[PDB]
């Protein structure tokens, strides 16, 4: 539902970014609900491109 809100706490911030990058490096595992929130470009995969898109959003360029 709320794209970018990886941890599902209702706000999009850099803590979601940490969670996203650690999951992409397989340092953590996401819950299924979190996976839907993590796929920020909605292409069906969670990867480095999602990390970069979320970073751009947090830097407010988009």
């Amino acid at each position: 539902v709320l794209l970018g809100d990886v941890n599902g706490d209702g706000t999009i911030n850099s803590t979601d970014l940490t969670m996203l990058k650690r999951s992409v490096l397989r340092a953590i595992t996401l819950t299924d609900d979190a996976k839907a929130r993590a796929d920020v470009d909605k292409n069906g995969s969670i990867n480095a491109a999602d990390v970069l898109l979320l970073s751009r959003y947090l830097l407010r360029v988009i």
Partner: protein
């Protein structure tokens, strides 16, 4: 919790100044990430760049640290997210987080102010209590109200 202090500096019109952003009360499990927004007046300050401070330990700082400058929006944005994925590049000590480089455009005070904060988390993703102290350039510049020393 964490205290973020914007330094206070002085400088003549036309000169470049550096405004440091200090971190205190760094958590026992470090800072894995932080995002926040400061406000500034582009009539007073032309922000030419923001450099990472020495508490950014990633040997390639741009992997962990990025900023954005918006003169039209009158804001500057900070994004830190330690890039190791293991907590290795987290912030572990108090010190300078960033240095804001600005050319002084007028003698009026050039306040740099806390606008918004997202999250400040440690290596366990525990969000921290955070407070800000505003600062900027020539903070006391004013028309005198009386005759005084």
């Amino acid at each position: 919790g964490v205290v973020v202090e914007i330094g206070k500096v002085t400088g003549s019109v036309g000169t470049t100044v550096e405004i440091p952003v200090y971190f205190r009360g760094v958590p026992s499990k470090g800072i894995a990430n932080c995002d926040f927004v400061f406000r500034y007046d582009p009539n007073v300050l032309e922000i030419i760049g923001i450099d990472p401070g020495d508490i950014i330990v990633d040997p390639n700082p741009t992997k962990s640290f990025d900023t954005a400058i918006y003169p039209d929006r009158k804001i500057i944005v900070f994004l830190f997210a330690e890039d190791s994925g293991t907590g290795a590049y987290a912030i572990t000590k108090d010190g300078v987080f960033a240095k804001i480089r600005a050319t002084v455009k007028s003698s009026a005070p050039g306040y740099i102010t806390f606008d918004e904060v997202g999250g400040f988390a440690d290596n366990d993703l525990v969000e921290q209590k955070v407070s800000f102290i505003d600062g900027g350039v020539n903070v006391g510049n004013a028309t005198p109200t009386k005759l005084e020393h």
